[PDB]
Design a protein around this ligand. Structure first.
Ligand code: ZN
Ligand code: ZN
Ligand code: ZN
Lengths: 50, 50, 1123, 64, 45
DNA sequence: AGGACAGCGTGTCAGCAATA
RNA sequence: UGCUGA
């Protein structure tokens, strides 16, 4: 029921425990990203009747 | 993050980048960081008797 | 009763209840009683009123060959909606959930059984199918009746819906209560434009609006002529006809001239101009040729036979009866009662003429009533049934006039030949709103009868079923006297809830406690009870002088002459019966007793209305404590306290239920409306109906055009208790914000407001719009081969990956201008057309409905695509409070530059403190403190008007609340400057207030045109905003540009940015038309004079050339001197 | 619709106190005591939960 | 394999060119397209 | 020549649906 | 024609 843009917003406002001092800023137009500047997380959930 | 009903599914990949709370609040690290000057209270006369 | 269980103060522990989402066992019952007048009227119109309508329906006799045939309609029946014929499967019923998905009308089948006879011995009953009539939603002929909220959720419905509307092409028309003069009551009027009706007419006359069983209405005017004579004007089929009285009185009653005269001089038997003028009416035009009832009927028959279009084989005496039955006093069955009613209306014109009575203002609600959806529906149904009879027998008479003996073989093939009619006529009145009728239905208005009901919010929707329109013609009037808010609309119309522009004073709204009467009762034992009480029948022996007696009327029928010292006791006895529900007096009869003195007050007499369209309102009947219901005219002769301790011993006959009974439903949602100035509170009512909120719960199903949704609404922490009676938190409208009243930025002045940027980035007031577009592809083609199937020819480079093999975008895909949007496929040829997305805004497809043809046999031609457009608060969007304090968003102030308080907080709205001094919205300054106290103590305070007096103030109360939380009485906390870091010298006023977001965004109101569609007729920019759209300059603006003496700016703009053309002229003969080009050198040559070297070019506009062409279109010549 | 993740004025995270708030109200605690027991001191945060209307529970009731 | 969910039956019907647009197991005339797994990118601002 | 009267008139400012 | 904005 939650939209895609609203889900993206809600996900942006969630605080991550990575310390930012071990990372670096993504260069302009660095869409891909690398171990140096990005962290990736996955949410995959499905609801079923028990 | 959301609520689901049987048959409903979420599946996504989130990318986290570094940034300062100046270009978006999501990157801000403190609830509030305000300050207040120390109050000073002086009894010019001895108050007594209810 | 019905207003008990009204909350005493609002609560907040209903949200956060373990049962919040469980659909309830029965529907709310306070929300149901809002559209109750729209549904209970239709319920009568379609079942009990339809039989009566068809019962009048004079049998349509006419001549075939040498034969006379009679056709009567015995019954007509409307059936609930259902799958067309049986050509469909698995469910006969048809629920309004569809026809909103598809775009169709919820229409039931209307069928009648006619009975045709030939002289009355040969007869057969055929059952014809008349057509389709639209159906209201919860109207007893609808499939959603008797369904609990849980079963109303499995059909895709609101679980809290009260229909009261129609779905004409899936648009929910909301026919609204228009204002009519009155019914079955003579209103004496002084209208100066009446003396133009003839040679000796005066500006005096009593008008009567007659309605019979809600199926027929007629307007009759009795005019006074200077001679002392009275005329009667009747209208038949929109033509005005004038009959001297006396012709009418002698026809209606077989009485001598003496008892008749003795009747029109009943109360003024000493006056001698009257006695002489009555005799002139009886003798001057009636002893001139006709002195028996039949001769009068015969003469009246001959003059009016031509325009009443009567049957040729009708005696003239029968054609007269037709006029009296169909044009004068429709309401009364008898001709003797019709005589006594025409005599009381005349006895009244004589009193208005002699200045013994006061003209009745037609614009006071005392002399006004409402036109409900059922009265318009039946009054159109009956007229269309009569028209159907007429058309079938037009076809009959016109076909052959041939030996009906064997023609009884095709009688049904004949009736069906014109039974093809009644369907489309009905949808016009509903889809368009305007009325096409031979008789205007005794209405006076022929447009705006039905309107679109838009669910922008649930406060826009709920106000369509409580609106009352004075009339659509009054929007065009020099004088403004139907816009005066007279003191007689106390408790019946809301003072504050009126549109605040061109519709002001004309579109009103009912108070919360007011209600329309819709029940129909027997009212047959009432005339026999009135006589037990003390009335003396119209027949005689009044026991006094006819001047010390009150004329008793009961719904148009004059019972007659209750004595003058028995009228008070009779009125009080009748009022006690209605209150205690004794006798059979309807709980809502209006016992009125307009006293008589020697002064020119309103005409005296005891009226007793019980008709089905008057407005009533509850009031606590003191001396009985039994919750009486009073009407608009009955309320003028009684004292009604508001607060207790205002009740006195002799004074204060009644008392009002709640102190805020006077205010509308929406005006009861404004917090502390008592401390704001009135133009503001009236403004609040128009801004609460343009708010972006939560409009409904059923998306994926509606397929509307636009639908604004606010993501995370909240419920006000300070709200009137009535907000909790009609749960309005099922549909929230705004958000609570921490507002500081400070002048800090330089960008919040003159009505502009500041929004913190971190609040806006954390989701403050985010929103969306749903644009549903119905693509029916029966367009782009006519009745040929199917060029219509959504589909992609395999491999098209145009739709490589934007469509999904059925020529429809993916659900979830993002659309931008120039993106593929659909792909049809002409099945025969085998060619596709990509049809690109042209809106210059980004959206995401969120659903696509594939619809069929109503017989489950459609072929992939119609679809409905819903796009989602994110509309978050930008700069230029309009916000508002609940007190009329609108203002655009001018800045998004960084969160580190905002003035932080000594508690660490930081406002998220900055509101300049200069909107208070001139607008005097002291309710915002109280809402801030109330909401801050609520957020602090976890409470929920009420902002009900009139609950806080001078002795118990609101500021005292909420300042004590604040001081009990460690804050300060006056609501000021001291801030620091987020830019210099110093504690400002002034302590700021901060609090929590409830902001609504308005539907007007700069994204919908911005235009730039450079060049584009040049209108072909004038070679000028086209206009609008959808194309490039230019900006009309105008005649008012060129004047200012030349005042500055900037001729060249005014030259450059008009000539070069508009129609600058380079035409040729016959310089010698000065004609624009003359120069000619050779067929391909192409040297210009003059047609009128054969000279080719005279032609030279001149700069000129195209509209100049267009004007030379237009002037030639009349033989006029424009000869122009070239230099 | 659903609980905001962070309070709009401050940025404090209140998206994890919805179920705890509902649980302390089912236990008999006033909204004031309940908002106190969750750590919502300044009234900007207290209004974020006190005036929240959970409409995700009413949208999650129409067919899939 | 283009799927469409019925309006109230919720049965997956696959429709094509040249065939009517009614639903099996019922006869309703409105059918919603289905969301497939396709990748879309959104920004968290 | 005292009238009676029939006869023209205008009416700030831009948008949208929708439909003739 | 019903709406809406200054
Ligand atoms: Zn020439
Ligand atoms: Zn906070
Ligand atoms: Zn199905």
């Amino acid at each position: 029921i939650v939209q895609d843009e609203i889900l993206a917003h809600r996900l942006g406002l969630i605080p991550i425990h990575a310390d930012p001092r071990l990372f670096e800023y993504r260069n302009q137009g660095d869409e891909e990203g690398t171990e140096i500047d990005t962290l990736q997380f996955r949410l995959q959930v499905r609801c079923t009747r028990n | 993050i959301a609520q689901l009903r049987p048959g409903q599914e979420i599946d996504l990949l989130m990318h986290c980048v570094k940034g300062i709370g100046k270009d978006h609040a999501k990157f801000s690290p403190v609830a509030t960081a305000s300050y207040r000057l120390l109050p000073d209270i002086t009894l010019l006369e001895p108050v007594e008797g209810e | 009763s019905r207003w008990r269980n009204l909350p005493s103060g609002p609560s907040l522990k209903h949200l956060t209840d373990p049962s919040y989402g469980i659909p309830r066992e029965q529907q709310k019952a306070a929300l149901q009683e809002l559209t109750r007048a729209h549904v209970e009227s239709f319920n009568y119109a379609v079942h009990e009123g339809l039989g009566l309508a068809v019962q009048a329906i004079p049998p349509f006799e006419f001549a075939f060959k040498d034969e006379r045939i009679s056709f009567t309609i015995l019954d007509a029946v409307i059936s609930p909606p259902t799958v067309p014929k049986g050509t469909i499967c698995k469910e006969a019923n048809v629920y309004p959930a569809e026809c909103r998905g598809r775009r169709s009308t919820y229409r039931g089948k209307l069928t009648a059984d006619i009975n045709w006879a030939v002289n009355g011995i040969s007869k057969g009953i055929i059952k014809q199918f008349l057509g389709y009539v639209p159906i209201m939603v919860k109207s007893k002929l609808c499939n959603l009746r008797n369904l609990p909220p849980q079963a109303l959720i499995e059909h895709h419905e609101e679980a809290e819906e009260m229909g009261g509307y129609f779905i004409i092409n899936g648009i929910e028309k909301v026919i609204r209560m228009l204002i009519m003069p009155r019914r079955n009551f003579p209103i004496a009027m002084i209208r100066p434009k009446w003396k133009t009706r003839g040679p000796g007419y005066t500006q005096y006359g009593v008008s009567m609006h007659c309605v019979r069983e809600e199926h027929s209405a007629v307007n009759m005017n009795l005019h006074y002529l200077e001679n002392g004579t009275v005329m009667l004007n009747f209208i038949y089929r929109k033509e005005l006809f004038f009959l001297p009285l006396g012709f009418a009185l002698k026809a209606l009653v077989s009485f001598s001239d003496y008892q008749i005269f003795q009747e029109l001089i009943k109360g003024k038997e000493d006056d001698s101009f009257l006695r002489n003028s009555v005799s002139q009416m009886l003798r001057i035009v009636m002893e001139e040729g006709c002195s028996t009832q039949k001769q009068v009927l015969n003469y009246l028959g001959e003059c009016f036979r031509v325009k009443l279009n009567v049957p040729d084989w009708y005696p003239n005496e029968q054609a007269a009866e037709f006029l009296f039955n169909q044009c004068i006093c429709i309401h009364l069955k008898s001709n003797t009662e019709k005589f006594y009613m025409l005599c009381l209306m005349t006895r009244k014109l004589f009193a208005l003429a002699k200045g013994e009575c006061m003209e009745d203002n037609p614009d006071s609600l005392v002399n006004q009533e409402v036109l409900t959806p059922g009265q318009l529906f039946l009054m159109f149904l009956k007229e269309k049934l009569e028209g159907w009879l007429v058309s079938i027998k037009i076809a009959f008479d016109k076909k052959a006039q041939k030996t009906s003996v064997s023609m009884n073989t095709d009688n049904l093939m004949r009736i069906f030949t014109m039974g093809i009619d009644l369907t489309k006529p009905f949808e016009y009145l509903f889809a368009t709103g305007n009325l096409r009728s031979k008789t205007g239905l005794g209405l006076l208005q022929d447009s705006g009868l039905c309107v679109v009901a838009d669910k922008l919010n649930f406060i826009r929707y709920l106000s369509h079923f409580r609106c009352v329109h004075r009339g659509a013609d009054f929007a065009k009037m020099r004088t403004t006297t139907v816009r005066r808010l007279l003191p007689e609309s106390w408790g019946f119309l809301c003072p504050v809830h009126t549109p605040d522009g061109e519709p002001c004073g004309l579109m009103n709204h009912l108070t919360a406690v007011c209600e329309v009467v819709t029940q129909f009762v027997y009212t047959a034992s009432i005339p026999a009870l009135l006589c037990n009480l003390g009335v003396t029948p119209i027949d005689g022996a009044p026991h006094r002088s006819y001047s010390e007696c009150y004329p008793v009327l009961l719904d148009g029928v004059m019972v007659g002459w209750v004595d003058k010292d028995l009228a008070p006791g009779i009125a009080d006895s009748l009022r006690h019966f209605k209150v205690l529900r004794e006798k059979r007096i309807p709980p809502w009869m209006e016992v009125v007793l307009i006293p008589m003195t020697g002064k020119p007050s309103l005409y005296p007499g005891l009226f007793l209305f019980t008709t089905p369209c008057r407005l009533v309102r509850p009031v606590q009947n003191l001396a009985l404590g039994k919750e009486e219901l009073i009407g608009t005219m009955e309320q003028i002769f009684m004292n009604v306290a508001i607060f207790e301790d205002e009740v006195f011993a002799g004074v204060t006959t009644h008392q009002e239920l709640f102190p805020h009974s006077l205010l509308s439903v929406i005006a009861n949602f404004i917090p502390f409306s008592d401390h704001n100035q009135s133009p503001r509170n009236m403004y609040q009512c128009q801004m609460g109906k343009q708010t972006m909120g939560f409009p409904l719960l059923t998306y994926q199903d509606r397929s509307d055009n636009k639908l604004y949704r606010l993501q995370t609404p909240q419920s006000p922490l300070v709200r009137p208790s009535m907000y909790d009676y009609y749960d309005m938190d099922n549909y929230p409208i705004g958000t609570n914000a921490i507002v500081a009243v400070i002048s800090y930025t330089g960008y919040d002045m003159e009505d502009a407001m500041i929004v913190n940027k971190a609040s806006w980035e954390r989701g403050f007031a985010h929103g969306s719009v749903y644009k549903s577009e119905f693509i029916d592809l029966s367009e782009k083609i006519k009745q040929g081969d199917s060029s219509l199937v959504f589909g992609i020819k395999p491999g098209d480079p145009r739709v490589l990956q934007k469509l999904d093999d059925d020529g429809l975008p993916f659900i979830g895909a993002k659309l931008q201008y120039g993106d593929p949007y659909y792909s049809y496929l002409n099945l025969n040829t085998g060619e596709s057309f990509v049809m690109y997305y042209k809106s210059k805004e980004n959206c995401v497809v969120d659903n696509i409905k594939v619809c069929s043809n109503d017989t489950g046999s459609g072929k992939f031609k119609c679809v409905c695509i819903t796009m989602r457009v994110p509309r978050n608060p930008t700069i230029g969007d309009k916000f508002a409070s609940r007190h009329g304090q609108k203002g655009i968003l001018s800045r998004l102030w960084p969160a580190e530059d905002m003035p932080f308080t000594e508690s660490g907080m930081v406002p998220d709205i900055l509101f300049n403190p200069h909107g208070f001094p001139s607008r005097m919205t002291i309710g915002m300054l109280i809402e801030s403190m109330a909401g801050k106290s609520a957020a602090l103590h976890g409470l929920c305070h009420d902002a009900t008007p009139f609950i806080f007096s001078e002795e118990n103030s609101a500021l005292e109360y909420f300042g004590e609340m604040l001081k009990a939380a460690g804050y300060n009485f006056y609501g000021t906390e001291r801030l620091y400057s987020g830019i210099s870091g110093l504690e400002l010298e002034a302590d700021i006023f901060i609090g929590v207030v409830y902001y609504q977001r308005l539907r007007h965004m700069v994204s919908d109101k911005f235009q730039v045109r450079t060049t584009g569609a040049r209108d072909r007729v004038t070679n000028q920019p086209i206009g609008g905003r959808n194309v490039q759209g230019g900006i009309r300059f105008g005649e008012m603006e060129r004047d200012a540009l030349l005042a500055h003496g900037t001729s060249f700016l005014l030259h450059d703009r008009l000539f070069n940015c508009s129609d600058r053309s380079v035409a040729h002229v016959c310089v010698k003969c000065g004609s624009l038309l003359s120069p000619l080009l050779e067929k391909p050198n192409r040297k210009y040559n003059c047609t009128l004079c054969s000279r080719s070297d005279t032609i030279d070019t001149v700069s000129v506009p195209y509209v100049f050339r267009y004007f030379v062409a237009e002037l030639a279109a009349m033989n006029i010549k424009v000869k122009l001197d070239v230099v | 619709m659903i609980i905001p993740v962070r309070c709009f004025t401050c940025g404090k995270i209140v998206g994890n106190k919805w179920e705890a708030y509902l649980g302390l109200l089912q236990a008999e605690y006033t909204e004031g005591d309940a908002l106190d027991a969750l750590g919502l001191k300044r009234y900007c945060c207290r209004r974020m939960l006190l005036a929240h209307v959970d409409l995700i529970e009413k949208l999650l009731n129409y067919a899939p | 394999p283009m799927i469409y969910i019925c309006g109230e039956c919720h049965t997956e019907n696959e429709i094509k060119s040249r065939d009517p647009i009614r639903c099996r197991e019922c006869g309703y005339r409105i059918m919603y397209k289905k969301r497939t797994k396709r990748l879309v990118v959104f920004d968290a601002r």
